[PDB]
């Protein structure tokens, strides 16, 4: 143990009508994942200490570094592959719907010490398809081993205790033996997946 094996997503084009709503999918996630850090009490360094509490990455998306605007891009692609990949289908349905979506205005204490404030899309007035519920459930699950298996490739290794000594961490685990609320937080990081599709007027069905 363990074996971490995602959707095989290696015979999924991406196609290029699907490229655009890509790029906002990452972007939310970034605000999704700024957002979130500074609920737990991150702040801004610049460089990553675990101990202030302190991220470089906390920033804009447009000033992200280059290589890490790719792995949120990644991120991004390889959960709308994913979908291809279990025989969903995405329609660009109406192209105006996303006029109307705004971005959630957080309070003043988000604001970070250069001036980086998350913004992501208010998405809370969404409620998806019961179809669509059970495709986030098998998203989240599946999100939990491309991350597993990124994870231990890099050389990460499960660990009683959580130690960036040498790569423990014990949310490497079978999806079956992980806790309740780190399942609930997936669904909720995925369930913002599928309502970012749908708020920009794109549609997509479980089958």
């Known amino acids: 143990s363990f074996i971490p094996c995602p959707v095989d997503t290696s015979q999924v084009i991406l196609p290029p009508h699907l490229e655009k709503i890509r790029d906002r999918l990452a972007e939310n996630i970034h605000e999704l994942w700024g957002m979130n850090k500074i609920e737990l009490g991150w702040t801004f360094g610049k460089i990553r200490d675990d ?3 302190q991220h470089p990455c906390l920033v ?3 000033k992200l570094p280059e290589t890490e605007k790719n792995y949120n891009l990644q991120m991004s692609t390889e959960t709308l592959k994913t979908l291809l990949a279990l025989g969903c289908h995405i329609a660009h349905v109406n192209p105006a719907a996303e006029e109307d979506l ?3 205005k957080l309070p003043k204490n988000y604001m970070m010490s250069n001036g980086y ?6 998405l809370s007035d969404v409620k998806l398809l019961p179809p669509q519920e059970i495709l986030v459930d098998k998203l989240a699950e599946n999100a939990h081993n491309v991350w597993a298996k990124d994870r231990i490739k890099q050389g990460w290794t499960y660990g009683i205790q959580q130690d960036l000594k040498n790569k423990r961490n014990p949310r490497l685990v079978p999806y079956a033996l992980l806790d309740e609320r780190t399942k609930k937080s997936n669904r909720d990081s995925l369930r913002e997946a599928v309502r970012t599709f749908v708020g920009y007027g794109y549609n997509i069905e479980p089958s």
């Open 117 to 122: 404030k998350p913004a992501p899309l208010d």
């Open 60 to 62: 804009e998306f447009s």
């Open 102 to 104: 705004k971005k959630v």
């Open 51 to 53: 101990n202030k509490r």
